[PDB]
Enzyme design. Structure first.
Site, PDB file in Angstrom:
ATOM      1  N   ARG A 229      15.820  -5.331  16.131  1.00 45.03           N
ATOM      2  CA  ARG A 229      14.558  -6.074  16.198  1.00 45.03           C
ATOM      3  C   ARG A 229      13.937  -6.167  14.801  1.00 45.03           C
ATOM      4  NH1 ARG A 229       9.117  -4.605  16.768  1.00 45.03           N
ATOM      5  NH2 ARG A 229       7.759  -6.294  17.524  1.00 45.03           N
TER       6      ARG A 229
ATOM      7  N   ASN B 258       9.171  -5.506   8.977  1.00 47.37           N
ATOM      8  CA  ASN B 258       9.802  -4.273   9.481  1.00 47.37           C
ATOM      9  C   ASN B 258      11.093  -4.623  10.173  1.00 47.37           C
ATOM     10  OD1 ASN B 258       7.253  -3.306   8.893  1.00 47.37           O
ATOM     11  ND2 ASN B 258       6.806  -2.558  10.936  1.00 47.37           N
TER      12      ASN B 258
ATOM     13  N   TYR C  81      14.090  -3.154  12.324  1.00 50.35           N
ATOM     14  CA  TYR C  81      14.445  -1.992  13.182  1.00 50.35           C
ATOM     15  C   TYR C  81      15.908  -1.991  13.605  1.00 50.35           C
ATOM     16  CZ  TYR C  81       9.374  -1.647  13.705  1.00 50.35           C
ATOM     17  OH  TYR C  81       8.027  -1.565  13.483  1.00 50.35           O
TER      18      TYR C  81
ATOM     19  N   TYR D 255       0.848  -1.194   0.000  1.00 54.29           N
ATOM     20  CA  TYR D 255       0.000   0.000   0.000  1.00 54.29           C
ATOM     21  C   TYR D 255       0.902   1.270   0.000  1.00 54.29           C
ATOM     22  CZ  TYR D 255       0.968  -0.558   5.072  1.00 54.29           C
ATOM     23  OH  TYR D 255       1.585  -0.715   6.289  1.00 54.29           O
TER      24      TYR D 255
ATOM     25  N   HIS E 151      -1.410   2.304  18.145  1.00 52.56           N
ATOM     26  CA  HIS E 151      -0.242   1.640  18.700  1.00 52.56           C
ATOM     27  C   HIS E 151       1.013   2.288  18.131  1.00 52.56           C
ATOM     28  CE1 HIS E 151      -1.395  -0.892  15.184  1.00 52.56           C
ATOM     29  NE2 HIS E 151      -0.093  -0.887  14.947  1.00 52.56           N
TER      30      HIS E 151
ATOM     31  N   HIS F  95      -0.081   5.171  15.063  1.00 54.64           N
ATOM     32  CA  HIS F  95      -0.944   4.859  13.912  1.00 54.64           C
ATOM     33  C   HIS F  95      -1.969   3.817  14.289  1.00 54.64           C
ATOM     34  CE1 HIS F  95       1.813   1.363  13.615  1.00 54.64           C
ATOM     35  NE2 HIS F  95       0.841   0.758  12.945  1.00 54.64           N
TER      36      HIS F  95
HETATM   37  O1  LIG Z   1       6.733  -3.495  14.863  1.00 53.04           O
HETATM   38  C1  LIG Z   1       5.643  -3.877  15.372  1.00 53.04           C
HETATM   39  O2  LIG Z   1       5.613  -4.822  16.209  1.00 53.04           O
HETATM   40  C2  LIG Z   1       4.332  -3.186  14.973  1.00 53.04           C
HETATM   41  C3  LIG Z   1       4.487  -2.257  13.751  1.00 53.04           C
HETATM   42  C4  LIG Z   1       3.108  -1.856  13.208  1.00 53.04           C
HETATM   43  O3  LIG Z   1       2.238  -1.582  14.001  1.00 53.04           O
HETATM   44  C5  LIG Z   1       2.747  -1.825  11.750  1.00 53.04           C
HETATM   45  O4  LIG Z   1       3.693  -1.785  10.885  1.00 53.04           O
HETATM   46  O5  LIG Z   1       1.478  -1.833  11.439  1.00 53.04           O
HETATM   47 MN   LIG Z   2       0.601  -1.286  13.061  1.00 50.11          MN
END
Ligand SMILES: O=C(O)CCC(=O)C(=O)O
Ligand SMILES: [Mn+2]
Length: 209
Positions: free
Chosen positions: A194, A110, A112, A63, A183, A121
């Site tokens: 992470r 993701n 990190y 997206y 969150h 968000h």
């Molecule tokens: O990194 C996470 O555990 C959550 C990240 C998140 O909320 C998302 O990308 O929608």
């Molecule tokens: Mn999220």
């Protein structure tokens, strides 16, 4: 309201320590491969999102100009969910009855760096069905809910709830926790590398480019 909102949030959350250290290590090696492949230019334009302390890799579906105006791309713009995701991760979730077979058609990794984060968000409700399923790797951290403190720090400095997210744990958001509250993740809770894998189902009638 605060203790009462925490209850309401906890109500829409589920967690299981589903992956052994050994399984996490196998999956983590694969995540490294995805990083290496992205770096060799092997993926499509919209598969890799690079930000300073956060890289994102979109598989299955991806997206996108305007807040909450996310739009799906022509599938074919992002790469296929790889085989190791299906077999090492999604299969185990299907096996242990967390989600049904065929639910998932979107996997986002993701990655990190230390001190990386993600700002307040809601996973966009117009793109994704619920529930949202996340699986964590490399290290423990925390996912915060009610992220007013990131933007109005005089009035408040703690989240409505803070949820530990261990390496190998699965977190499943629904109802209140996915829909009616934000969150985020704080820089301070990412002490070492992470990575998380987010497994979702896009809506059929999701808006599209
Ligand atoms: O990194 C996470 O555990 C959550 C990240 C998140 O909320 C998302 O990308 O929608
Ligand atoms: Mn999220």
């Amino acid at each position: 309201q605060k203790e009462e909102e925490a209850r309401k949030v906890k109500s829409g959350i589920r967690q299981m320590r589903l992956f052994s250290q050994d399984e996490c290590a196998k999956i983590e090696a694969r995540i490294d491969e995805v990083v290496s492949r992205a770096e060799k230019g092997l993926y499509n334009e919209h598969t890799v999102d690079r930000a300073p302390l956060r890289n994102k890799y979109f598989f299955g579906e991806g997206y996108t100009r305007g807040p909450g105006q996310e739009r799906l791309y022509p599938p074919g713009d992002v790469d296929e969910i790889p085989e190791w995701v299906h077999q090492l991760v999604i299969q185990k979730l299907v096996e242990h009855r967390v989600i049904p077979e065929g639910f998932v058609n979107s996997a986002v990794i993701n990655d990190y760096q230390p001190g990386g984060c993600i700002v307040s968000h809601v996973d966009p409700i117009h793109i994704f069905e619920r529930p949202i399923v996340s699986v964590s790797f490399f290290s423990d951290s925390a996912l915060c809910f009610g992220c007013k403190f990131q933007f109005k720090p005089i009035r408040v400095s703690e989240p409505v709830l803070s949820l530990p997210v261990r390496r190998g744990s699965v977190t499943v958001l629904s109802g209140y926790a996915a829909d009616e509250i934000t969150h985020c993740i704080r820089p301070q809770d990412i002490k070492e590398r992470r990575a998380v894998i987010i497994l979702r189902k896009t809506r059929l009638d999701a808006p599209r480019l």
